[PDB]
Specification:
3 copies of one chain form a homotrimer.
Chain A: E1 2-8, H1 22-28, H2 31-36, E2 41-47, H3 66-85, E3 89-94, H4 100-108, E4 115-119, E5 170-175, H5 180-188, E6 192-195, H6 196-216, E7 223-228, H7 250-263, E8 266-272, H8 282-299
Parallel strand pairs in A: 1-2, 1-3, 3-8, 4-5, 4-7, 5-6, 7-8
Helix pairs in contact in A: 1-8, 3-4, 7-8
The structure holds S-2-(boronoethyl)-L-cysteine (3 copies), chloride ion (CL) (2 copies) and manganese (II) ion (6 copies).
Residues 97, 120, 122, 124, 228 of chain B line the site of one manganese (II) ion.
Catalytic activity (chains A, B, C): L-arginine + H2O = urea + L-ornithine
Family (chains A, B, C): Belongs to the arginase family.
Subcellular location (chains A, B, C): Mitochondrion
Chain lengths: 306, 306, 306
């Protein structure tokens, strides 16, 4: 199958400097030639350059870089819909997870019935209303779920975003650090998730059976994999903004990816939050980058059996 | 609920120097404001200062610092029964595991019907008759079980100790390094345990279902959680006196703690054997201390899903 | 039962220097008294000294040290069939995995109906016409399977070797790095294997149920356990020549061993590829050495339960 690669060097969804280098790190870890090695037909859109927004201040005094994030995502959305439109499976390399706003919005533009698999240590479902930090990379899901739009203040530059997917079309895997408001939202709207605790009881295998039952149980449909590198234990992925011990194992991470590929329904994938600068050493940075590449490669066919 | 915290910088239950700094390390890892963050009402008794015993030599030429250990434990037993008395859930930060003699003694003093959940790589049930090292931190359970009574030589400074719980009131989790004599006694008095193998075959959640069936199946009763940091795999908890490979996973460790909290029956908790000096680097020592806090925090409510 | 130990300090099945020090490392990690401690009757054959072959270059310009490996194996083959003959369960401590050519040949010499459990990160089933490196430690299985001999060129010094076991009498456990040609062979001859992926999905316990069904389902028969230390994750077994991430867990490896011991059919065991010189530190070397001993001890009765 054909794969498209887009580098999104964005970092204004949070305050740590360095996530804008994520794309370069992953690329330098051999992502590209690793993909043809599988046999994929490649289309590299290069690394996007987003238009900054001068004097983009706090909305209501906490939401950070609203219109800067809204514009970058609007641009990314057009490139992603373009690739998905030409039949490509879109691979977006992040910066921060706020980019999921644009990639899922651009993807949904052509595959309205898409479902989402969110692999992350966090739920990123805070709204401008419940956030404590004001950092938009922890609010992506808010602006995408239809049942939430009534409790999601509209931010400057977010005009264009239009809530698409239903709360039943997204499943979380790996949650291990959820804020109380986020927990209220997940329970209230019955959003399905499998925390590390659920994985400790059911096992990654049983977890994937179910998430696919929820999403594609009654019918085939486009799958969107938004993979946050911090979903892996910090010992496996040091180079990241918000590490949280007790994460996914290298095998589990690879198992999730392998299982998604076996569905044959992957239409778009996000690999985000890889921050080279936050690594203690050169090796730590390289370890994370390689881990990122493995997840992507494995999502497109790479096997542990050959 | 209200929580009491007692630091017992004791190290004479064994030979390595450094366990006396365990409390400070755990404290310096945020334990205190971490517990408040949960909503617990805290009463910090500070770090106790045990009275030493000059010229406290080997009894029968092997048992080490008998009277020094017997006095420190007596002493601790009173602070603990004081706290338990005022309705506090007593949290003791060790030095070595010989301290359990005091904490369980003092706790039983007010909750005679308490049951014990011992999470350790070792069973710590050697008697002064069966020990090979002579260190007392590997003999705690001996002085506490009633069925062992008459098979436990009386040492200098141990006169005050009176066997409280029965063998049927303690359950082991994590065992992987058991001496032949301990195995003989575990089998002879039918004491229940779940070795690393049992956990491998049953799953950590199936393990917790069972320990609570044995302990609190027929009735509600106070639970004493004695947690030896070496129950965790050495890669997760480096800073400790007697590492043993193939231990508990970070997740399983947290799972045990979460499950205990879910019983709502936790009265006291021991977090022992954290030895900073035994760490290779500064980060390894911090890793162990942070793991210690996560265990305690988790035992009192901290969640992986907010 | 009675056990025989044979040290094979051979390293010419590959290019890295150091594997010849594997036996000493394992021995110096307490192997011998660890086996007595179990109750086993030991017969140490010491460390063999293989006759070098001067001017033993590449056959067809790639196959490395052909006759040197062929001669070393023929000699080992006699010592092994000697021990197996006197009723001993034969334990060979490697150098490199090419030694399996000798150990399995010698073993087969008396127990023609033996079955093989191959615990390795690799399949080591490349033939002289498919290898890329030319190193013979990646081709052992080729000279042993009967259905392959037709596509296996005859090398200098291999005259004596005679294909013994059938393709259905060998099961792989832990595969996670297979070359395209190897994959073709496995599929083509229906050779059974449980890759790290199959393990993540079925669990180590289920894996063993199955391999034993394939091998000893219809009848009891001798078991040859060829255990490459690189089957363990690099974090558990650093000191080895070809590290591959996402491998067996210490607990899983010990589970495999314990399970094989439970069958009571172990005849010979290979513990290969331990290379102390590849360790970054003294401790890393010691860790790998101890792991090797545990696997052997466990395969002969050692329990995590006592
Ligand atoms: N609850 C956190 C979420 S951190 C989200 C970061 B990441 O994209 O990595 O999940 C907040 O709003 O500050
Ligand atoms: N069997 C050992 C027990 S070491 C006990 C130490 B600890 O408290 O960590 O279990 C002995 O008596 O030397
Ligand atoms: N495919 C590799 C195999 S490396 C085999 C080494 B070992 O014995 O550790 O599996 C080759 O032929 O170079
Ligand atoms: Cl603090
Ligand atoms: Cl039979
Ligand atoms: Mn995220
Ligand atoms: Mn995250
Ligand atoms: Mn202990
Ligand atoms: Mn212990
Ligand atoms: Mn190997
Ligand atoms: Mn091998």
């Amino acid at each position: 199958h054909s794969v498209a690669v887009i580098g999104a060097p964005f970092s204004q969804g949070q305050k740590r400097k360095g996530v804008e280098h994520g794309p370069a790190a992953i690329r330098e870890a051999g992502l590209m030639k690793r993909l043809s090695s599988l046999g994929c037909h490649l289309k590299d859109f290069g690394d996007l350059s987003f238009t900054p927004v001068p004097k983009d201040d706090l909305y209501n005094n906490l939401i950070v870089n609203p219109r800067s994030v809204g514009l970058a995502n609007q641009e990314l959305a057009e490139v992603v819909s373009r690739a998905v439109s030409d039949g490509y499976s879109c691979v977006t390399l992040g910066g921060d997870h706020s980019l999921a706003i644009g990639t899922i919005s651009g993807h949904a533009r052509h595959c309205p019935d898409l479902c989402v698999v969110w692999v992350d240590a966090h739920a990123d479902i805070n709204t401008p209303l419940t956030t404590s930090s004001g950092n938009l990379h922890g609010q992506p899901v808010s602006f995408l779920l239809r049942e939430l739009q009534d409790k999601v203040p509209q931010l400057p530059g977010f005009s264009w975003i239009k809530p698409c997917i239903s709360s039943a079309s997204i499943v979380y895997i790996g949650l291990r650090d959820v804020d109380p408001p986020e927990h209220f939202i997940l329970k209230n709207y019955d959003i399905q998730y499998f925390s590390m605790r659920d994985i400790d009881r059911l096992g990654i295998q049983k977890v994937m059976e179910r998430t696919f039952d929820l999403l594609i149980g009654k019918r085939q449909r486009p799958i969107h994999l938004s993979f946050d590198i911090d979903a892996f234990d910090p010992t496996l992925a040091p180079a990241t903004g918000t590490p949280v011990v007790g994460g996914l194992t290298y095998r589990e991470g690879m198992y999730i990816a392998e299982e998604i590929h076996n569905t044959g329904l992957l239409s778009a994938l996000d690999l985000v939050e890889v921050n080279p600068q936050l690594a203690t050493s050169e090796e730590e940075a390289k370890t994370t980058a390689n881990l990122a590449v493995d997840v992507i490669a494995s999502s497109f066919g790479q096997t542990r059996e050959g």
